[PDB]
Symmetry: D2
Subunit: 326 residues, 4 copies
């Protein structure tokens, strides 16, 4: 192998029409590399178990949560490309120090699927990048753009192998960590989700608390009324893993509102919008049940929303159930 298409090179060669974005990305990828390495020897570096605090969303934080958060913050700030960061792990927006100030806003989940670290299930890092457009002092309000205004977004999946899915507006590209070469190399370009899939994905243990629309849709997946095979169920419990399987296999992923979580559980800014962006870029759909997730005007950095995404025909059929029930 003497001509490897690294991430950086592919972004440079397609983007031939902005560098500052590509420098922000290279910092993110460095963080992702560092995280991936820590994840991969987590038990040996005695890194499982609690950290000893709760975040502003009610999540019992792990030792990795803290570690991967500083990696991302330090790396992003050091790029000279950011002004405002939002993180699952910090209460307020982190304003970049003036001497390092750049034009971009990043919303990120430094480690997703935390309840699944101990059992070595796939886990990930999720990010959305915006451009600061307002003229005032950098504040949390700059991070409150509609996901419709994302400049680049994606996720890292620390699974059986380490993978980045990324989009800067021209489709989704999949990159993979080459351990030999310590870099991300392109493996799939311009991935498009199947129009219709064969897998449904949700925590079905909340059945007792679903609204009628959800209850009905699920019934159709398991008990179709047209002789077709019932859909297979899969639910990893790490949103990155479930969302990535959705992208490459097809199907639907659901984390909707329920009685216990009246407005959904997943965070709009740094979980829902980044994956919504990827799925839309891949020809799929991503909805709250009433509108596309990317069209929701966020009103608070840690705001939650319902999320239903995946193959267009599957989401369309889910939205029918919503209409048929309101």
């Amino acid at each position: 192998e003497t001509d490897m298409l690294t991430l950086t090179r592919y972004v440079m060669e397609k983007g031939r029409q902005t560098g500052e974005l590509t420098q922000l990305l290279n910092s993110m990828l460095t963080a992702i590399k560092a995280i991936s390495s820590a994840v991969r020897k987590a038990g040996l570096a005695h890194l499982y178990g609690i950290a000893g605090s709760v975040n502003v969303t009610g999540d019992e934080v792990k030792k990795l949560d803290v570690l991967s958060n500083s990696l991302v913050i330090n790396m992003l700030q050091s790029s000279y490309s950011t002004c405002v960061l939002v993180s699952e792990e910090n209460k307020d927006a982190i304003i970049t120090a003036k001497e390092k100030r750049g034009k971009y806003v990043v919303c990120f989940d430094p480690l997703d699927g935390s309840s699944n670290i101990d059992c070595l299930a796939s886990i990930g890092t999720i990010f959305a990048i915006y451009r600061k457009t307002s003229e005032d002092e950098p504040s949390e309000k700059d991070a409150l753009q509609c996901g419709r205004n994302i400049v680049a977004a994606g996720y890292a999946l620390y699974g059986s192998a380490t993978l980045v899915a990324l989009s800067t507006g021209q489709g989704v590209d999949l990159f993979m960590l080459d351990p030999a070469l310590g870099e991300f190399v392109l493996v799939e370009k311009d991935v498009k989700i199947k129009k219709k899939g064969k897998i449904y994905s949700l925590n079905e243990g909340y059945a007792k608390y679903f609204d009628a629309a959800t209850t009905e849709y699920v019934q159709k997946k398991k008990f179709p009324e047209d002789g077709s095979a019932p859909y297979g169920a899969r639910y990893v419990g790490s949103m990155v893993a479930d969302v990535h399987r959705t992208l490459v296999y097809g199907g639907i992923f659901l984390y909707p509102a329920n009685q216990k979580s009246p407005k959904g559980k997943l965070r709009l800014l740094y979980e829902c919008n980044p994956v919504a962006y990827i799925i839309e870029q891949a020809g799929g759909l991503a909805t709250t049940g009433t509108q596309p997730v990317l069209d929701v005007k966020p009103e608070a950095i840690h705001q939650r929303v319902p999320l239903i995404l995946g193959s267009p025909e599957d989401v369309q059929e889910y939205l029918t159930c919503v209409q048929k029930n309101q």
Copy 2:
């Protein structure tokens, strides 16, 4: 770190009461190491997609299936410790060549969770080791012992990190691959499963085809009749991953008989018995619904069985549903 407890050293220091077993294991671990490395750069070494054949169980084989199978076969044979191997990927039993003949029989699944390779979910390698006891020529019949007669058994999980769970009769020990040192190092000794868990795990997309006992038990998990919280649902779709989460978090994993699979789908010899062995060693239970899996006399190397395993109280409650319905 100047005093690392490697697998080999822990087995040597506890087993102070057989080397030939420990040499067989060291060969297995070499195979596992090789597999883990291949898995981890699978997309880059262009290793996804089909192989171009079906196995004797009806499974569309992947390129890895073939690769990891030869690794295991070559490694095991080379140990001078085996006489008979059974593999998911080979139609008949593989008799070791006379000049390399040893006393042990190994049943293995060289790569489990094959439908989940492309989406980078956790996948694994599963193995059970027996002692040849009969006096005749090494044949498939030597591989047909009850799992009750296992001498050592375990699995490798190629997840966010690479882990081996192993038992030689004195409890379960968890080892992890140290990438720096290229060896397995002990992380948890004598793991014991929770008496009762909070997670149920099955492909719920077969709901339409469950027998009444299964339908009823699941109803109790989602709609308890005693005010308690419903159990959470998790289903990775790779039996190693689901079984490992069961071991460390607690709960229940189910792949029972259904209309489409009248006698279950998982293979007795190289899937069910090895995990049944681990779970029993950890204080859990593993049943076909009518007897403990380890007590089933196998009659054919590729025989299937129903599998329900996990926290004792959870399995007990499942067996009630079976009694209450027969």
Copy 3:
């Protein structure tokens, strides 16, 4: 470690006063990473022994020579930053294709110390970067600048660890490959060579062919006339290794003219100028015996010169011997 000073970040944060240079470098580093990985498993990937040709300097080429050459060429060209490359391994200058044309000229030795690959001695990659200043069509003549006009230069040393020494005009910085993180991280900033050292380094097996000046200087190292200890001898036989030891320990490295090589043996463009640049940046000296190497106007891409470099006082004393003998 949550705030790592990677190469890229250090160059970005010091250079705060040009990106296109930093993109050229990132491509070089990718090549260096790839080479380092190949070197490190060279025997296993059956990569020792001949390639089956001779280069335009009379060197029997190895399989690595060829491999590392394409890596460097493909990587550099792909940066969109080059117009002209010179390589030890190619007869003529390689003009970049118009659609990828940039402003920089690179002279490189893709793998140095080739006679030392088989015995696993340290080996390296050497490079000098110039800015195209002339207005005509990109040609070999653009690569014929005085090393005095270097914009950035350095070397990779694939030793017990992998290290890059780099200068862009503001001193020498040492970076090291972090295998965990797949990147170069700063280990020493602004290294300065000892004014006077205690080690002399040359192939002493050419004693019979040295000119009087060299013979005399060496006599003074082994038989001092002032009661001081004689200098220690060290000679690895890979110029990068010997030159790097010179930089960090102090002393002198000599590959001067001799009867067999009347004008020296080392190549001016892609061996001598890059190390001359590093040593001068570090407060040392690097001479042909009659002038500073960086002041030689090259007249041909594969031109050779005598090289004597290292601690200033040691080189000064060597130049005395030259004056005292002409």
Copy 4:
């Protein structure tokens, strides 16, 4: 690659005629693996510079010296295979604790070429294994056997790649660390040194202090009296590196007695005997100048001797110079 010849497997398959030796070796290799990994990120893990003490041979100890020493001691002791260790870094012999006592004696240099760590030259680990033959309490005296009585011996070279040379009495075999697989794999079997070489290797900076025999031999290498080409000079300054180059390229390596070191400088037990053993096994010679090194009865664990080894015809010619001068 589906059938890799690992060290362990090659030793097992050739030794088909002792396991306890092979378990001792597997512990050594684990130590070597750990050391190799530490060496390779030595600058990043801030591991250069002094330790703050002197050993009983007069050597300013490094931080690695200490680290690699405990690795070797802990690993070897844990094998249940040793009774007595001798180390360059410990004043007295280390008697194994009774409950871990085995039959073997190991003499080792846990890290050789310490003055060359900072400049990233090749460095190594050197070892000789004996069988305890005496009946008394394990003491230092058990470590005082003639190298003629070695049961297995070799070295690790942490160079551009990591290599082990090993002999158990049936020739020399070369193994290499596969980073992918974390194990040593055979690369060359039964290596034999060239009858006569073209490279001479010694610290020539001691010229002023050589005895006449050495002065004369060196004169013949640089100023032959028969029209042949003078030999090339190479001197890395790490005995493992120089000795390994000698083995694979041919030639001679010299660290003889001189005025400053009247009885030589290299340590008999854990430097000279192990390499003497390798070279003799490879058809070469290794002498003190008056007898074969392996025939010297050691009288003290930290005893020094002159060492001249390499291609037989070259050593023979050196011994002539000794005879011609006594």
